[PDB]
Design goal:
By secondary structure, the chain is α+β, with helices and mostly antiparallel strands. It is built from 31 helices and 13 strands. Among the domains are: about 5-55; about 440-540, no CATH class; about 550-620 and about 700-725, no CATH class; about 625-695, no CATH class. Helix 12 (about 275-285) packs across helix 14 (about 330-345) and helix 17 runs parallel beside helix 19. The protein binds one RNA strand through strand 2, helix 14 and helix 18. It catalyses: DNA(n) + a 2'-deoxyribonucleoside 5'-triphosphate = DNA(n+1) + diphosphate.
Length: about 725
RNA sequence: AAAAAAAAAA
């Protein structure tokens, strides 16, 4: 990195790049070996430049405790290679499972989009969007190499990529990788299976599959189901938590408790899937041409070298298991699990939980898959056989030791047959999920999710006390260490939190920032913006308030990829959860009791807007399909007529004296609109009140809840907005 | 200490 910032070295390497390749332009060889030789000559040149600058300036198989550096090499290497070398040869048996069920088929245009030749725009975007301060596959290189030498490799990489077009093979240096062993959180180091494989590959290799990932990233939503939320941009991890928690609330209210909840976690699923399976599934869903050709060469014979205690252990062929840390690998992880997800979904012998008209049966993540079952006498047994059959074709062995379950039964005699037969660790109190605890009882959801939470900072704040640093150095780590983690809890679990709860949370922080001393500056002044002299002190009371309103956005957009919002129980007339925000309010209809995470949002949604002195039921950002127009008898087809034309807001449609007539294309639309609809709609905005309500400039608050579809920093806008009003 | 989750911290 330091050598990469030298102007003389930069010019020398620019000259070497310019007059190196055009010295042996021979047709006898290929471009991959020339590429590797260019890497080697770059390594030699950097070695020479560094020299010039320096001149100028655990338990074994028997269970015994072993500490010998030579002995441990023979154990972990054998254990890793034993699992990695086991490649399934039952190719004919493998295809039978795939033909049993159905997988999506990509349209030719999408395949052509994946088969589209790499342009000069993808190269610049990926290299620009390359995070720094990281370590790739060694190569004697670093990440800053391609972020500084962009100009000479912008056309050159296409030439390197053009070689793949006529060959479909990868360079020998592309296959190398560096698996880094890091311990799992809160696990003993004595067991050889408690380490995490972190394989770092070449930046050039890391680039290559990224477009392969990026090309399928634009099509991943069509491929996999919406149930999986792992590593899918536009989808958040807490989706399952809210989805899952609603089930226990349903199970608690349900008098007939005979359903079972299991959190199936797999032991190192990142490395125990079969390359033949993942290659043929990629063939089975319509992918072919270059995409099938290039993906075959990527995993034709991948290998990785182990590094431990400063030893460059020799590499070995990864016969099975996708490479860890590859950006494309998680996308492939979903697909191999996707057919698994469909297999359980399409298995009608095992039934899912029917929440009204919504069918909820299972959920996925990276490793912590959860399946909801009822009548475990048959359904649970039917679950095991499919996984073993999937394991028989993929090596997907479920970690029954580390995976718990939740049993809800009314007869103790029936319960005895579960632990006796089902080998799952039936935990009757709580289970682990990404740091959250799905309590058996909803009344205990507050206790086991926040009482451990409040004491978590109690000893955490009991550590950063003796550091000789200023009071300014206390608030920043609060926003860095504890603040990011807590909002995960509110986002996953927005229960009505008593004011007493925030007392300990605030007071613990208060003694931390001043180091067990009285406040030197006013809290209100310090809570203001930097412009007014403040530091923007975190306010968890509003952060909880903001996070309760964070989910208020999803009702407006009503994306079909979110199902958890429809899981709330309702013993009365069906879903209205789409026509609530920015719509006419329904009278003589109040939610509560069974509803836990929706009514509180509405109670908090109305509270904030009333303080703003705003009418939320009629806004410029009102949806065209809002119930305000559905109050009277209207034709559903009529909304579809202008859905393709304007589609977004009633305001753009026209109001006042501009009934569906404000823009030239509307003149070509009114003919399509039914004439009984015109008289119905011409009376809608005739009233003066209806005009002023919409004919107004939208404020900042309504902006974020309509625009800003890339909902990544919704907290920042809402919390800042709540700071000003409150 | 990598793919992806995130608070923006400017």
């Amino acid at each position: 990195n330091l050598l990469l910032n030298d102007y003389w070295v930069h010019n020398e390497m620019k000259a070497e790049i310019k007059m190196f390749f055009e010295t042996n332009e021979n047709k006898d060889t290929t471009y991959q070996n020339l590429w590797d030789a260019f890497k080697a000559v770059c390594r030699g040149k950097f070695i020479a430049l560094n020299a010039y600058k320096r001149k100028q300036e655990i338990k074994n198989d028997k269970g015994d405790i072993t500490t010998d550096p030579t002995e441990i090499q023979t154990t972990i290497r054998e254990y890793y290679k034993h699992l990695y070398a086991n490649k399934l040869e039952n190719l004919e048996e493998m295809d039978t499972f795939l033909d049993t069920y159905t997988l999506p088929r990509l349209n030719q245009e999408e395949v052509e989009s994946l088969n589209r030749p790499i342009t000069g725009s993808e190269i610049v975007a990926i290299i620009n969007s390359l995070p720094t301060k990281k370590s790739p596959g060694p190569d004697g290189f670093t990440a800053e190499f391609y972020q500084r030498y962009k100009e000479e490799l912008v056309p050159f990489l296409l030439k390197l990529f053009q070689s793949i077009e006529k060959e479909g093979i990868l360079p020998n240096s592309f296959y190398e990788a560096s698996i880094i062993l890091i311990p799992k959180p809160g696990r003993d180091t004595t067991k050889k299976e408690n380490f995490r494989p972190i394989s770092l590959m070449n930046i050039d290799a890391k680039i290559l599959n990224k477009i392969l990932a990026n090309r399928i990233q634009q099509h991943i939503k069509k491929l996999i189901h919406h149930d999986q939320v792992g590593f899918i941009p536009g989808m958040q991890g807490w989706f399952n938590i809210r989805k899952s928690i609603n089930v226990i609330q349903h199970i608690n209210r349900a008098k007939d408790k005979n359903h079972v909840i299991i959190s199936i976690d797999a032991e190192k699923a990142f490395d125990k899937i079969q390359q033949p399976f993942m290659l043929k599934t990629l063939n089975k869903l319509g992918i072919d041409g270059m995409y099938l050709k290039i993906i075959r060469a990527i995993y034709d014979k991948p290998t990785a070298n182990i590094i431990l205690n400063g030893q460059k252990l020799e590499a070995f062929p990864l016969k099975t298991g996708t490479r860890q840390g590859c950006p494309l690998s998680p996308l492939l992880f979903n697909i191999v699990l996707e057919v698994l997800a469909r297999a359980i979904r399409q298995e009608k012998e095992i039934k899912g939980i029917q929440l009204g008209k919504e069918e909820v049966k299972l959920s996925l993540f990276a490793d912590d898959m959860i399946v909801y079952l009822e009548n475990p006498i048959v359904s649970a047994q039917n679950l095991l056989k499919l996984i073993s059959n999937f394991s028989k074709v993929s090596g997907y062995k479920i970690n029954v030791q580390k995976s718990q379950a939740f049993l809800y039964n009314n007869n103790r005699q029936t319960e005895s047959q579960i632990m006796g037969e089902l080998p799952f660790t039936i935990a009757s109190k709580r289970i682990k999920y990404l740091g959250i605890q799905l309590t058996r009882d909803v009344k205990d959801l507050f206790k086991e999710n926040y009482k451990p939470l409040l004491k978590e900072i109690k000893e955490d704040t009991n550590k950063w006390k003796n550091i000789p640093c200023s009071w300014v150095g206390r608030i920043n780590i609060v926003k860095m260490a504890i603040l990011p983690k807590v909002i995960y809890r509110f986002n996953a679990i927005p229960i009505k939190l008593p004011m007493t709860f925030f007392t300990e949370l605030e007071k613990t922080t208060l003694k931390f920032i001043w180091n067990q001393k009285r406040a030197r500056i006013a809290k209100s002044i310090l809570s203001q913006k930097n412009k007014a002299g403040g530091i923007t002190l975190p306010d968890f009371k509003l952060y909880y308030k903001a996070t309760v309103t964070k989910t208020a956005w999803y009702w407006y957009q009503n994306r079909d990829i979110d199902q958890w919002n429809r899981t709330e129980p309702s013993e009365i007339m069906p879903h209205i959860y789409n026509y609530l925000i920015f719509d006419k309010p329904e009278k003589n209809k109040q939610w509560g009791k069974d509803s836990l995470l929706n009514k509180w949002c509405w109670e908090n949604w109305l509270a904030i807007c009333r303080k703003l002195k705003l009418d939320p039921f009629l806004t410029p950002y009102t949806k065209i399909n809002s119930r305000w127009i559905k109050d009277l008898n209207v034709k559903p087809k009529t909304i579809k007529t202008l859905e393709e034309n304007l589609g977004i807001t009633i305001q753009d449609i026209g109001v006042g004296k501009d009934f569906m007539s404000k823009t030239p294309k509307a003149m070509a639309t009114k003919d399509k609109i039914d004439k009984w609809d015109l008289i119905k709609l011409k009376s809608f905005c005739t009233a003066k009140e209806t005009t002023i309500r919409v004919n107004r400039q939208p404020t900042t608050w309504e902006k974020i809840f309509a625009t800003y579809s890339s909902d990544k920093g919704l907290i920042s806008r809402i919390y800042n907005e709540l700071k000003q009003i409150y």
